[PDB]
Ligand binder design. Sequence first.
Ligand SMILES: Cc1cc2nc3c(=O)[nH]c(=O)nc-3n(C[C@H](O)[C@H](O)[C@H](O)COP(=O)(O)O)c2cc1C
Ligand SMILES: Cc1cc2nc3c(=O)[nH]c(=O)nc-3n(C[C@H](O)[C@H](O)[C@H](O)COP(=O)(O)O)c2cc1C
Ligand SMILES: Oc1ccc(O)cc1
Ligand SMILES: Oc1ccc(O)cc1
Lengths: 180, 180
Amino acid sequence: HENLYFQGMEGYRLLYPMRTYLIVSGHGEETNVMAADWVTVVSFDPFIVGVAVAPKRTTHKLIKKYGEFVISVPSLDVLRDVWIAGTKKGPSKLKEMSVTLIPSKKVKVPSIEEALANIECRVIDARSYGDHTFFVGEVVGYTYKDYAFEKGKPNLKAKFLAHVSWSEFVTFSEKVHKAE
Amino acid sequence: HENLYFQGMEGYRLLYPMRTYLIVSGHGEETNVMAADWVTVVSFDPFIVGVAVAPKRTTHKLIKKYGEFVISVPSLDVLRDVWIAGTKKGPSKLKEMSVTLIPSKKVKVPSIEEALANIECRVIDARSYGDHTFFVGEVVGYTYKDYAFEKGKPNLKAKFLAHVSWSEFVTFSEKVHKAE
Ligand SMILES: Cc1cc2nc3c(=O)[nH]c(=O)nc-3n(C[C@H](O)[C@H](O)[C@H](O)COP(=O)(O)O)c2cc1C
Ligand SMILES: Cc1cc2nc3c(=O)[nH]c(=O)nc-3n(C[C@H](O)[C@H](O)[C@H](O)COP(=O)(O)O)c2cc1C
Ligand SMILES: Oc1ccc(O)cc1
Ligand SMILES: Oc1ccc(O)cc1
């Protein structure tokens, strides 16, 4: 991580491996995509999510400007596009990405056709905690690939993406352990 | 999920599978443990985390009372204890759990010896979003099993736990995909 003055494992690695998502922001020619690991659900009813975004991301500027974002769920198969989203800066990176933008249902920010799911969000809060803004978004629509969620739960065959360390990613075992 | 009036897939399942963690709260005879999926990192420097906790959890009462919590990282091997933490209520459940409580380094809330990591947190914010409180905790200490993080990144052999649907859990493939 940049800005690690005392060399060693970043403390946050203790929560890893974490899922990796894509955050879409802006629209029209301002459409941008970045990689985000620091995403979670914050409410069931209503459905509300949150994502921690550094002020230095172009994505940060776009979410503040428009008050909307999309969380797109990538699979392992689009890793190259995820790595571009997480390493290049601003809307020009899209020319380098195999992803197709399609209209969202409720938000003006586009969805990604290849994503396993697209979760459409309106910003309801933006708190600063240390070196990131935690953008909290009420979910106002969603679409998904029917097969990635057949029978109302994730289908592990879809290769949902997770992040181990800087350059290294994994998916899940297909081997399900039942708790009851 | 309880309180689903219109039967169907909960929208939040679109972020799944998610990692499953344990949240320790209270101390002495009030020590409690629950399961939590809705956890993420919110800052690198300083290291800050957050967890979404329903007001109805005993854990919610204990974090408000003491202003501290521990995120303990379970492996697949302690699934039975995780399921107890996520289904039974209050400190009496501990009598049913194979877990050993040990002192934390900085917080008064105990750590779990069997956990792959224990992340010690002081509450700095508690916002209400829909039906959960998002407790934000500055990390004031941590311990971990050396082997689960050998070479400063997670060791996939440690069987980090993730949640698919209600009763079903998985771990990660050991098969690493390199992005560069
Ligand atoms: C796997 C991965 C996960 C990332 N997660 C986050 C995150 O949660 N929050 C964040 O602010 N940046 C994250 N980053 C960094 C941004 O994706 C990266 O800075 C990107 O180049 C920003 O692009 P932008 O300036 O177009 O918004 C991540 C990068 C990678 C590779
Ligand atoms: C895998 C799993 C994950 C859970 N995640 C959360 C969560 O993120 N937040 C929450 O409030 N409850 C969560 N729950 C529910 C609580 O763990 C459950 O209500 C528990 O019985 C609460 O115990 P307590 O009353 O002792 O705090 C989860 C349950 C399971 C099984
Ligand atoms: O700001 C960041 C958050 C998570 C990452 O994996 C990388 C950068
Ligand atoms: O409040 C809850 C959050 C996540 C869960 O998996 C279960 C309950």
